[PDB]
Amino acid sequence: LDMLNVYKCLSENISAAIQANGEMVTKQPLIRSMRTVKRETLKLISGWVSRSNDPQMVAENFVPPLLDAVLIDYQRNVPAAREPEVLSTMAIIVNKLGGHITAEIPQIFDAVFECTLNMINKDFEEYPEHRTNFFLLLQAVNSHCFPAFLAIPPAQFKLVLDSIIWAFKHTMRNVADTG
Amino acid sequence: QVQFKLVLVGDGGTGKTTFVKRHLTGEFEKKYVATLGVEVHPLVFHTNRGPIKFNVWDTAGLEKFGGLRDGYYIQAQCAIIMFDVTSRVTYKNVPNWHRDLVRVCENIPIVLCGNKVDIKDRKVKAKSIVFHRKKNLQYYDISAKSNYNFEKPFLWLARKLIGDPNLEFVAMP
Amino acid sequence: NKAIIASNIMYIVGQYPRFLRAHWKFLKTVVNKLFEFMHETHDGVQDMACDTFIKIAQKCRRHFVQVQVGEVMPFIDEILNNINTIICDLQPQQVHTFYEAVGYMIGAQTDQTVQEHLIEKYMLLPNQVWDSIIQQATKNVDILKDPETVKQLGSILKTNVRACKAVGHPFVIQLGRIY
């Protein structure tokens, strides 16, 4: 719990710094250091759920605090400050928890989906990592939580499928293939 | 300290541009912005036998951004074919690139580079990379993302062009 | 008799958010019924209808700010574009309880940009009175001594206090505008 608090403290410290002085700030000691606490925090979270062996207990205790701490934080971050590893970290947990998380896709996809989509829908170049990861995530949900794609409204579903079209139109081999 | 013309070729996303940038700036480009036609880039290495300059003709891999394709190669003095170990397709087309190139340059020191070794899930096992053998090309495993065997291709070409099997990079002012 | 029964029905439906959160159409039907009961002149009905509505909003806050199946726009919008036609017959205190209820819905929209627009319109009605009283005070400060205008400044503030209790930090955009 505390670890999530500090993660969020740093995540909000970084985004502000960027919002106040542009991407450039990322390129200096303190920020790069704060990025590290975030990234290792994510490694730890995903690194454990992977080797965990009690899906439900994991979905009912270690997942909900992720929502406000890491997801809605990723949402509120300025585009330049959002952590790509947040998406891939989440992708891994979907692969593991599967059906036990199918009911949280609504809550999750809200935060990350649309907001991330708007970062990668202008061209095919900017925010590479965000492209790659985002679709590892979308792949995972579709793969182990398909029922979710039915719960949501036709308007949202469409937005999802057309996102896939968008994937396989990429010139980055990996992104287009995942699509 | 004379120079040489180095033509760099391969499929798209192969990492041709990214490879070149690393050398001059030291930075690593994460984005994929396809090269239109060509982009001559002068590179300099300092050896024990005086400075050496490569005019890198970073050409395009994509078919619609081709350019004066075979037209760029003329007057070349060495080349580098590059493929991506994460995509077999880019290794199966290597023969096509070596083709166009030698039909323009009959005898020039060439190097074959398998880029992207850093990515753990490698789809092109070393066991398969044998094309250089019968065509008498040099080969290396490289990564623009980790500087792995970073300077091998250039060090080797230098050995050949300066006719010295003992040339060594030193980075002396 | 009908009012005593209707209240109990409304009490029961108020105690089972789990059921409301799974059945939007019902939730929708309930909320609208409450909006109708809000012009009921029979004793207590209006207090009943408000209590239930704030209750429900608190417990179902997310369903009002996210688009449901069968809709093309978040329910809040219909509610906000109609605040006056709904609360026109309510008493002062009930109007505050109503504003607090919508405040909770606003607090669900975690997306910065949209929450800000929601907030601006949420406080638009009260703001008019404020802005009005303020410009006149910048011509004659003897107006802030006027019994009626002081009665309004009280109620406006009282409304501002409830909205803040529910909206939370993001409400800063409002406080700053009048601080």
Ligand SMILES: Nc1nc2c(ncn2[C@@H]2O[C@H](COP(=O)(O)OP(=O)(O)OP(=O)(O)O)[C@@H](O)[C@H]2O)c(=O)[nH]1
């Ligand atoms: N993981 C990893 N990625 C790499 C490596 N080298 C290049 N890339 C990525 O692969 C893509 C290759 O981009 P470019 O260098 O422009 O490829 P290119 O050969 O110039 O493509 P064209 O100009 O169209 O012929 C970029 O997104 C790089 O970030 C590598 O060694 N490891």
Ligand SMILES: [Mg+2]
């Ligand atoms: Mg290029």
